[PDB]
Design a protein around this motif. Structure first.
Motif, PDB file in Angstrom:
ATOM      1  N   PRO A 261      50.648  34.529  37.755  1.00 14.26           N
ATOM      2  CA  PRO A 261      49.572  33.612  37.040  1.00 14.26           C
ATOM      3  C   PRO A 261      49.303  33.697  35.584  1.00 14.26           C
ATOM      4  O   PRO A 261      48.448  34.754  35.705  1.00 14.26           O
TER       5      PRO A 261
ATOM      6  N   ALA B  24      46.291  33.327  32.619  1.00 13.40           N
ATOM      7  CA  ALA B  24      44.876  33.552  32.741  1.00 13.40           C
ATOM      8  C   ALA B  24      44.216  32.417  31.925  1.00 13.40           C
ATOM      9  O   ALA B  24      43.072  32.139  31.833  1.00 13.40           O
TER      10      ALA B  24
ATOM     11  N   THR C 167      41.258  30.298  33.160  1.00 11.90           N
ATOM     12  CA  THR C 167      41.856  29.912  34.300  1.00 11.90           C
ATOM     13  C   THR C 167      40.691  29.771  35.493  1.00 11.90           C
ATOM     14  O   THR C 167      40.746  28.683  36.269  1.00 11.90           O
TER      15      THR C 167
ATOM     16  N   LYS D 135      37.437  45.096  36.891  1.00 13.03           N
ATOM     17  CA  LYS D 135      37.109  44.288  35.917  1.00 13.03           C
ATOM     18  C   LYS D 135      38.464  43.982  35.038  1.00 13.03           C
ATOM     19  O   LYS D 135      39.609  44.292  35.428  1.00 13.03           O
TER      20      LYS D 135
ATOM     21  N   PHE E 232      38.340  34.401  53.297  1.00  4.47           N
ATOM     22  CA  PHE E 232      38.963  35.298  52.341  1.00  4.47           C
ATOM     23  C   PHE E 232      39.930  36.406  53.408  1.00  4.47           C
ATOM     24  O   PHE E 232      41.194  36.682  52.843  1.00  4.47           O
TER      25      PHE E 232
ATOM     26  N   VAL F  14      43.331  46.534  45.530  1.00  7.46           N
ATOM     27  CA  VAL F  14      43.635  45.213  45.883  1.00  7.46           C
ATOM     28  C   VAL F  14      44.455  44.248  45.069  1.00  7.46           C
ATOM     29  O   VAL F  14      44.981  43.553  45.361  1.00  7.46           O
TER      30      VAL F  14
ATOM     31  N   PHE G  25      43.938  36.274  52.696  1.00 10.42           N
ATOM     32  CA  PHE G  25      44.379  37.661  52.324  1.00 10.42           C
ATOM     33  C   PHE G  25      45.691  38.153  53.087  1.00 10.42           C
ATOM     34  O   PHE G  25      46.822  38.443  52.654  1.00 10.42           O
TER      35      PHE G  25
HETATM   36  C1  HEM Z   1      45.048  32.534  39.091  1.00  5.92           C
HETATM   37  C2  HEM Z   1      44.970  33.864  39.613  1.00  5.92           C
HETATM   38  C3  HEM Z   1      44.653  34.970  38.980  1.00  5.92           C
HETATM   39  C4  HEM Z   1      44.864  35.316  37.583  1.00  5.92           C
HETATM   40  C5  HEM Z   1      44.912  34.753  36.308  1.00  5.92           C
HETATM   41  C6  HEM Z   1      44.170  36.608  37.593  1.00  5.92           C
HETATM   42  C7  HEM Z   1      44.276  37.330  36.402  1.00  5.92           C
HETATM   43  C8  HEM Z   1      43.620  38.871  36.348  1.00  5.92           C
HETATM   44  C9  HEM Z   1      43.515  39.747  35.413  1.00  5.92           C
HETATM   45  C10 HEM Z   1      43.911  39.056  33.856  1.00  5.92           C
HETATM   46  C11 HEM Z   1      42.995  40.858  35.721  1.00  5.92           C
HETATM   47  C12 HEM Z   1      42.592  42.053  34.583  1.00  5.92           C
HETATM   48  C13 HEM Z   1      43.505  43.072  34.530  1.00  5.92           C
HETATM   49  C14 HEM Z   1      43.189  44.286  33.543  1.00  5.92           C
HETATM   50  O1  HEM Z   1      42.884  43.989  32.514  1.00  5.92           O
HETATM   51  O2  HEM Z   1      43.192  45.226  34.225  1.00  5.92           O
HETATM   52  C15 HEM Z   1      42.863  40.737  37.072  1.00  5.92           C
HETATM   53  C16 HEM Z   1      41.991  41.819  37.795  1.00  5.92           C
HETATM   54  C17 HEM Z   1      41.740  41.769  39.062  1.00  5.92           C
HETATM   55  N1  HEM Z   1      42.274  40.831  39.891  1.00  5.92           N
HETATM   56 FE1  HEM Z   1      43.004  38.965  39.244  1.00  5.92          FE
HETATM   57  N2  HEM Z   1      43.996  37.098  38.914  1.00  5.92           N
HETATM   58  C18 HEM Z   1      44.145  36.289  39.569  1.00  5.92           C
HETATM   59  C19 HEM Z   1      43.990  36.049  41.032  1.00  5.92           C
HETATM   60  C20 HEM Z   1      43.586  37.272  41.670  1.00  5.92           C
HETATM   61  C21 HEM Z   1      43.571  37.156  43.274  1.00  5.92           C
HETATM   62  C22 HEM Z   1      44.228  36.232  44.062  1.00  5.92           C
HETATM   63  C23 HEM Z   1      43.144  38.541  43.675  1.00  5.92           C
HETATM   64  C24 HEM Z   1      43.070  39.246  44.726  1.00  5.92           C
HETATM   65  C25 HEM Z   1      43.305  38.777  46.159  1.00  5.92           C
HETATM   66  C26 HEM Z   1      42.964  39.289  42.625  1.00  5.92           C
HETATM   67  C27 HEM Z   1      42.487  40.577  42.286  1.00  5.92           C
HETATM   68  C28 HEM Z   1      41.928  41.273  41.357  1.00  5.92           C
HETATM   69  C29 HEM Z   1      41.125  42.356  41.276  1.00  5.92           C
HETATM   70  C30 HEM Z   1      40.573  43.092  42.269  1.00  5.92           C
HETATM   71  C31 HEM Z   1      41.094  42.711  39.802  1.00  5.92           C
HETATM   72  C32 HEM Z   1      40.344  44.052  39.319  1.00  5.92           C
HETATM   73  C33 HEM Z   1      41.411  44.946  38.901  1.00  5.92           C
HETATM   74  C34 HEM Z   1      40.729  45.998  38.140  1.00  5.92           C
HETATM   75  O3  HEM Z   1      39.796  46.645  38.129  1.00  5.92           O
HETATM   76  O4  HEM Z   1      41.679  46.951  37.700  1.00  5.92           O
HETATM   77  N3  HEM Z   1      43.300  38.451  41.363  1.00  5.92           N
HETATM   78  N4  HEM Z   1      43.215  39.503  37.399  1.00  5.92           N
END
Ligand code: HEM
Length: 291
Positions: free
Chosen positions: A142, A144, A231, A176, A259, A44, A263
């Motif tokens: 974006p 963080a 953020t 995570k 959601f 996702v 999405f």
């Molecule tokens: C301002 C918005 C967002 C920021 C700053 C952001 C930032 C991040 C960061 C820094 C990670 C961790 C990456 C890693 O170290 O592997 C992450 C993971 C993730 N994000 Fe976001 N994110 C944002 C929005 C979203 C949105 C809108 C979605 C989905 C609709 C999303 C879904 C995910 C998911 C599921 C993970 C987990 C991925 C994994 O386990 O490998 N994120 N995000």
């Protein structure tokens, strides 16, 4: 720039449902990934990162073109770690060579969410692979380390309003952060491969303390072992965002219904669907199919 959805020649619902079943059967099978979280969370994140590059001003970026397949967007620093979701989907693309890239990346997102017990997401086919030169420049995704002011203004480029932004943020109940991918480390919660409203309940209920992590970045850590990024923590510091977080913490169905709408909007931004195009497909889960 106009991008018109063209259905893959001769393909219909049952064909797409077979690609979904293939992705879903492989999610089941590869459960070892990332300490037994499985590949559903990185998929996702992959569908949001290929979609999140959109600019509403000139219609560039967005899921249509499938341009993550090209090195400029594949190697974007913001996309670190997504190579794992890409390598997951590749045997599926070899198996179904007729599906377009942006269609496969986005449907993988739909499959992950519905198989992780989340809401049904309507999906539309028709994304067409465009050339190496329609690939967006890096820097459109974006930061963080910022505040709710940044969050509102950033999501306005993809014309998401407050509610859509908060609904979209709850996908952080999943998976995570990983120090090596982003300079941040830690789960958002306990059930991180099941889709729930856990994100909001944690944001509201934990005793969060600001700490620097091993990469010298601030993050909010809690006594339970959880974390929150600067953020998304500011979503409780903004009066309008906070009223929506409390809404979703209290009502999971509402969060799922919102959601699902947000999405799908995210995955179709930038795409024009002709009047004759097939309706959104609601794909069955393996479970529903007895598989
Ligand atoms: C301002 C918005 C967002 C920021 C700053 C952001 C930032 C991040 C960061 C820094 C990670 C961790 C990456 C890693 O170290 O592997 C992450 C993971 C993730 N994000 Fe976001 N994110 C944002 C929005 C979203 C949105 C809108 C979605 C989905 C609709 C999303 C879904 C995910 C998911 C599921 C993970 C987990 C991925 C994994 O386990 O490998 N994120 N995000």
């Amino acid at each position: 720039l106009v991008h018109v959805a063209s259905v893959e020649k001769g393909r219909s619902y049952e064909d797409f449902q077979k690609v979904y079943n293939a992705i879903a059967l492989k999610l089941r099978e590869d459960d070892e990934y990332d300490n037994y979280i499985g590949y559903g969370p990185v998929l996702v994140r992959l569908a949001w990162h290929i979609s999140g590059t959109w600019d509403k001003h000139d219609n560039t970026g967005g899921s249509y073109g499938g341009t993550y397949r090209f090195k400029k967007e594949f190697n974007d620093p913001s996309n670190a770690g997504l190579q794992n979701g890409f390598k997951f989907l590749e045997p599926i693309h070899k198996e179904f060579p007729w599906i377009s890239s942006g269609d496969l990346f986005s449907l993988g997102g739909v499959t992950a969410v519905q198989e992780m017990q989340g809401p049904k997401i309507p999906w539309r086919c028709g994304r067409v692979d465009t050339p190496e030169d329609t690939t967006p420049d890096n820097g459109r995704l974006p930061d963080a380390d910022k505040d709710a002011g940044y969050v509102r203004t950033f999501f306005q480029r993809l014309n998401m309003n407050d509610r859509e932004v908060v609904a979209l943020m709850g996908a952080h109940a999943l998976g995570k952060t990983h120090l090596k991918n982003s300079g941040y480390e830690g789960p958002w919660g306990a059930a991180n491969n099941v889709f729930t409203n856990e994100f909001y309940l944690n944001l509201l209920n934990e005793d969060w303390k600001l700490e620097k992590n091993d990469a010298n970045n601030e993050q909010w850590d809690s006594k339970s072992g959880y974390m929150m990024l600067p953020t998304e923590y500011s979503l409780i510091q903004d009066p309008k965002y906070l009223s929506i977080v409390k809404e979703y913490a209290n009502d999971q169905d509402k969060f799922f219904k919102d959601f699902s709408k947000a999405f799908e909007k995210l995955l179709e931004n930038g795409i024009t669907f002709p009047k004759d195009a097939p309706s959104p497909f609601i794909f069955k889960t393996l479970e529903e199919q007895g598989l």
